[PDB]
Design an enzyme around this catalytic site. Structure first.
Site, PDB file in Angstrom:
ATOM      1  N   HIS A   1       0.933  -0.882   0.144  1.00 12.30           N
ATOM      2  CA  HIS A   1      -0.427   0.032   0.085  1.00 12.30           C
ATOM      3  C   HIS A   1       0.886   1.273   0.250  1.00 12.30           C
ATOM      4  CE1 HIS A   1       0.400  -0.112   4.322  1.00 12.30           C
ATOM      5  NE2 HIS A   1       0.410   1.024   4.326  1.00 12.30           N
TER       6      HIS A   1
ATOM      7  N   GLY B   1       2.695   7.171   8.321  1.00 13.95           N
ATOM      8  CA  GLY B   1       3.966   6.941   8.580  1.00 13.95           C
ATOM      9  C   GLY B   1       4.648   5.884   8.673  1.00 13.95           C
TER      10      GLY B   1
ATOM     11  N   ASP C   1      -0.772  -7.834   1.253  1.00 12.56           N
ATOM     12  CA  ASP C   1      -0.024  -6.423   2.046  1.00 12.56           C
ATOM     13  C   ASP C   1       1.758  -6.478   2.124  1.00 12.56           C
ATOM     14  OD1 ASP C   1       0.317  -3.236   1.568  1.00 12.56           O
ATOM     15  OD2 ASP C   1      -0.547  -3.568   3.455  1.00 12.56           O
TER      16      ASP C   1
ATOM     17  N   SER D   1       4.078   2.462   8.854  1.00  9.65           N
ATOM     18  CA  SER D   1       3.163   1.412   7.580  1.00  9.65           C
ATOM     19  C   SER D   1       4.322   0.415   6.894  1.00  9.65           C
ATOM     20  CB  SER D   1       1.883   2.124   6.619  1.00  9.65           C
ATOM     21  OG  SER D   1       2.975   2.152   6.194  1.00  9.65           O
ATOM     22  N   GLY D   2       4.427  -0.163   6.373  1.00  9.59           N
ATOM     23  CA  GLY D   2       5.490  -1.326   5.943  1.00  9.59           C
ATOM     24  C   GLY D   2       7.005  -1.809   6.770  1.00  9.59           C
TER      25      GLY D   2
HETATM   26  N1  LIG Z   1      -1.778  -0.495  13.789  1.00 12.78           N
HETATM   27  C1  LIG Z   1      -3.165   0.377  13.182  1.00 12.78           C
HETATM   28  N2  LIG Z   1      -3.704   1.003  14.138  1.00 12.78           N
HETATM   29  N3  LIG Z   1      -3.061   1.433  12.044  1.00 12.78           N
HETATM   30  C2  LIG Z   1      -1.753   0.640  11.261  1.00 12.78           C
HETATM   31  C3  LIG Z   1      -1.399   1.724  10.693  1.00 12.78           C
HETATM   32  C4  LIG Z   1      -0.856   1.777   9.622  1.00 12.78           C
HETATM   33  C5  LIG Z   1      -1.344   2.820   8.333  1.00 12.78           C
HETATM   34  C6  LIG Z   1      -1.645   4.080   8.628  1.00 12.78           C
HETATM   35  N4  LIG Z   1      -1.329   4.530   7.501  1.00 12.78           N
HETATM   36  C7  LIG Z   1      -0.287   4.703   6.895  1.00 12.78           C
HETATM   37  O1  LIG Z   1       0.795   4.441   7.677  1.00 12.78           O
HETATM   38  C8  LIG Z   1      -0.828   5.884   5.429  1.00 12.78           C
HETATM   39  C9  LIG Z   1       0.147   4.937   4.843  1.00 12.78           C
HETATM   40  C10 LIG Z   1       0.184   5.627   3.174  1.00 12.78           C
HETATM   41  C11 LIG Z   1       1.501   5.960   3.160  1.00 12.78           C
HETATM   42  C12 LIG Z   1       1.310   6.378   1.033  1.00 12.78           C
HETATM   43  C13 LIG Z   1      -0.372   6.248   0.796  1.00 12.78           C
HETATM   44  C14 LIG Z   1      -0.828   6.056   1.386  1.00 12.78           C
HETATM   45  C15 LIG Z   1      -1.075   5.323   2.766  1.00 12.78           C
HETATM   46  N5  LIG Z   1       0.978   6.469   5.899  1.00 12.78           N
HETATM   47  C16 LIG Z   1       0.786   8.255   6.138  1.00 12.78           C
HETATM   48  O2  LIG Z   1      -0.768   8.519   5.443  1.00 12.78           O
HETATM   49  C17 LIG Z   1       1.555   8.851   5.482  1.00 12.78           C
HETATM   50  C18 LIG Z   1       3.516   8.195   5.055  1.00 12.78           C
HETATM   51  C19 LIG Z   1       3.911   9.601   4.709  1.00 12.78           C
HETATM   52  C20 LIG Z   1       4.107  10.504   5.427  1.00 12.78           C
HETATM   53  N6  LIG Z   1       5.524  11.620   4.704  1.00 12.78           N
HETATM   54  C21 LIG Z   1       4.682  12.876   5.687  1.00 12.78           C
HETATM   55  O3  LIG Z   1       5.435  13.428   5.388  1.00 12.78           O
HETATM   56  C22 LIG Z   1       3.680  13.838   6.078  1.00 12.78           C
HETATM   57  C23 LIG Z   1       2.866  12.544   6.367  1.00 12.78           C
HETATM   58  O4  LIG Z   1       1.929  13.024   7.107  1.00 12.78           O
HETATM   59  C24 LIG Z   1       2.658  11.228   5.849  1.00 12.78           C
HETATM   60  C25 LIG Z   1       1.739  10.165   6.009  1.00 12.78           C
END
Ligand SMILES: NC(N)=NCCCCCNC(=O)[C@H](Cc1ccccc1)NC(=O)c1ccc2[nH]c(=O)cc(O)c2c1
Length: 236
Positions: free
Chosen positions: A44, A186, A93, A188-189
């Protein structure tokens, strides 16, 4: 990471920060060194990423402030996404990044072992989630790599908490019943790393969940042991 603490430099030497350079450079996602040319991460993360040419992998990082225009990084030659992936919440994923050059291992950067199929019966009691993600739902990327210890929950337990989803055996869940500690945006992965018989194993990849650190909403992770054949196939 919500409810975590700052990591010690070098204590998660498989953890990388994957950046995008478009439109200006920023942290995109966590990932794990699993081989000298190979990062394992979530599929993702590459939504709308057209080309690997906009990606930069930084290893041996504790603080995002270490990263400047003159800091060395690994280029990405190829993004490999599981061919059955559609979105995080339906599974698969998982993604591999093939780096353009090989990682020279050192105390600051080295690979994490993948779990063995013989470890499906293992009861991990020492599991940690790490990353530079938000410390709460509305927040920003953190300078210092954070860590939190989080207990695994059974899939049956996890399924009760996500009645609108299908929690499959290719997923693994982790969380406190009362919430308070979890991965967030942030993160994730990145890895869910579990220490067992004095060795760290890559048990999960941070994937999805409802909000961050909410009571009775554990994190959901890709169950890495179910992908060992795919990883072998895609890396050979
Ligand atoms: N365990 C729990 N409770 N939840 C699980 C949490 C994991 C999912 C959360 N989403 C995420 O982690 C997004 C996933 C995503 C990445 C890339 C594109 C779309 C979506 N990541 C983000 O929303 C994300 C990633 C990089 C970022 N860099 C920045 O400089 C500023 C940000 O606001 C920022 C936000």
């Amino acid at each position: 990471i919500v409810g975590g603490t700052a990591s010690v430099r070098g204590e998660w030497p498989w953890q990388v920060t994957l950046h995008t350079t478009s439109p200006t450079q920023r942290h995109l996602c966590g990932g794990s060194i699993i081989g000298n040319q190979w990062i394992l991460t979530a599929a993702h993360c590459f939504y709308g990423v057209e080309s690997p040419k906009i990606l930069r992998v930084y290893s041996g990082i504790l603080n995002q402030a270490e990263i400047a225009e003159d800091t060395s990084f690994f280029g990405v030659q190829e993004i490999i996404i599981h061919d059955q992936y559609k979105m995080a919440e339906s599974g698969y994923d998982i993604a591999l990044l093939k780096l353009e050059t090989t990682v020279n291992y050192a105390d600051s950067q080295r690979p994490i072992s993948l779990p063995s199929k013989g470890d499906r019966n293992v009861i991990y009691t020492d599991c940690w989630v790490t990353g530079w993600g938000y410390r709460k739902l509305r927040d920003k990327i953190q300078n210092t790599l954070q860590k939190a210890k989080i207990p695994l929950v059974t899939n049956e337990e996890c399924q009760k908490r996500y009645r609108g989803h299908k929690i499959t055996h290719k997923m693994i869940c982790a969380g406190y019943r009362e919430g308070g500690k979890d991965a967030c945006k942030g993160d994730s992965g990145g890895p869910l790393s579990c220490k067992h018989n004095e060795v760290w194993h890559l048990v999960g990849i941070t994937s999805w969940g409802e909000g961050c650190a909410q009571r009775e909403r554990p994190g959901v992770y890709t169950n890495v042991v179910e992908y060992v054949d795919w990883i072998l196939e895609k890396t050979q």
